[PDB]
């Protein structure tokens, strides 16, 4: 890469299709998850806060406690174990 | 310079003028010849069909187009026919003219990318195919082998 910032090579994943533009619905930013639940990580281009490193977009983690309103989701990067601080707005129930 | 240097479609598409400067102008004079005032209202319509994807330098186009039109003056400077070269030299081309150090070349020209089977030239004529000859002279100056194809014309 020509630079090594966090948003390097994220033009696609952190951009909205024109119609899905503008503020997102609150219903999913308030969703409540319980420790144990499988959740899919995907940043909402509209939602500035509660994000996580773009590199994890696409992960399906397990909710294990929370910090503030933010959730703590455990994922496995490659073969490494990691804990991701992400808000509901950027999460979805698996299945 | 030789056609062997840019006749293949092996480089990525390089056409964005917003990121390229110093693009030589196209030598191609016109794309519509003959009676452009009238519309394709002719009985016969032959086409020069390229047989292999290649790149055709605006050099080749102009030389191929003149040679045919210039020849289509077997019909008169204001003859009854309409000639058309449907391709435009979009693909920009460079040359590394230091050795291989910082070798990204400098824009030296443009070439149009034609895929095999596309028709580069189209002429419209009444049962008076002198055009078929204007094209034996045209694909004479372009890299690829070509097929001279006739569409509306069962007046054989």
């Amino acid at each position: 890469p020509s630079s090594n910032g966090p948003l390097e090579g994220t033009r696609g994943k952190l951009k909205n299709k024109p119609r899905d533009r503008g503020t997102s619905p609150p219903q999913r930013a308030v969703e409540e998850f319980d420790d144990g639940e499988k959740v899919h990580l995907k940043i909402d281009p509209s939602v500035p806060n509660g994000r996580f490193h773009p590199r994890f977009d696409g992960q399906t983690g397990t909710v294990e406690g929370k910090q503030g309103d933010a959730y703590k989701v455990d994922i496995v990067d490659g073969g490494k174990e990691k804990t991701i601080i992400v808000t509901a707005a950027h999460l979805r129930r698996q299945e | 310079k030789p056609g062997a240097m840019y006749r293949n479609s092996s480089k990525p598409a390089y056409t964005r003028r917003e990121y390229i400067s110093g693009i030589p102008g196209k030598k191609i004079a016109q794309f519509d010849m003959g009676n452009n005032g009238a519309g394709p209202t002719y009985p016969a319509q032959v086409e020069l069909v390229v047989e292999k994807p290649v790149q055709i330098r605006h050099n080749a186009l102009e030389a191929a187009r003149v040679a045919a039109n210039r020849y289509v003056q077997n019909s008169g400077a204001a003859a009854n026919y309409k000639f058309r070269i449907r391709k435009f030299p979009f693909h920009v081309i460079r040359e590394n003219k230091d050795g291989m150090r910082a070798p990204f070349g400098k824009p030296v020209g443009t070439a149009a990318r034609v895929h095999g089977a596309n028709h580069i030239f189209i002429a419209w004529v009444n049962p008076d195919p002198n055009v078929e000859e204007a094209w034996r002279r045209a694909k004479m100056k372009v890299t690829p082998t070509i097929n001279i194809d006739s569409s509306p014309a069962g007046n054989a």
Partner: protein, 186 residues
């Protein structure tokens, strides 16, 4: 509308009904909301919660079904709103609801307004609602005193027939008194 790339607002924004930005902030408390809504002639007070396919109303009160308890005066006024607030408040309590936050829709947070009135009532009913006393009306205006005095500059009855001529902030007391004990639907 114009093209594939055109962005159409959320239905409830087209209709100019729900302030979503304000809705997120509300929902944040994680408590039930005390929906305070008005109409030219009435006043409604709901206690909404969050659901799978949309909100769920657990308890409510309309200034209309206020007469069902002895209300014989208009219903688009200060006293009217309060009691409906209190009335919804009680049915709320019954529901097992204990706390909520005041959603005033696209209304203005003007001091002594009827929406704070609705809040003041739902509060007294037993509900725990974050609030601020000095943004509420001075009680008297809640009883309907402002209207009694306004009919003092009579010469012509404020109420087209209706009930009384000099109006009754006391009829207000009578009703609040009533709702604060027993009775059906509470």
């Amino acid at each position: 509308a114009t093209g594939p790339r055109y962005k159409v607002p959320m239905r409830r924004r087209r209709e100019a009904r729900t302030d979503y930005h304000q809705r997120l902030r509300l929902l944040k408390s994680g408590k039930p909301r005390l929906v305070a809504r008005k109409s030219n002639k009435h006043v409604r007070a709901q206690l909404v919660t969050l659901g799978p396919n949309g909100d769920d109303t657990l308890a409510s009160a309309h200034s209309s079904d206020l007469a069902e308890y002895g209300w014989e005066a208009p219903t688009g006024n200060m006293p009217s709103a309060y009691l409906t607030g209190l009335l919804a408040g009680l049915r709320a309590q019954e529901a097992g609801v204990e706390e909520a936050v005041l959603d005033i829709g696209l209304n203005s947070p003007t001091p002594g307004s009827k929406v704070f009135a609705i809040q003041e009532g739902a509060i007294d009913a037993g509900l725990d609602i974050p609030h601020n006393d000095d943004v509420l009306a001075d009680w008297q205006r809640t009883r309907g005193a402002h209207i009694a005095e306004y009919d003092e500059q009579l010469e012509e009855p404020l109420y087209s027939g209706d009930f009384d001529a000099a109006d009754l902030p006391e009829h207000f007391d009578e009703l609040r008194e009533t709702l604060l004990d027993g009775d059906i639907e509470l």
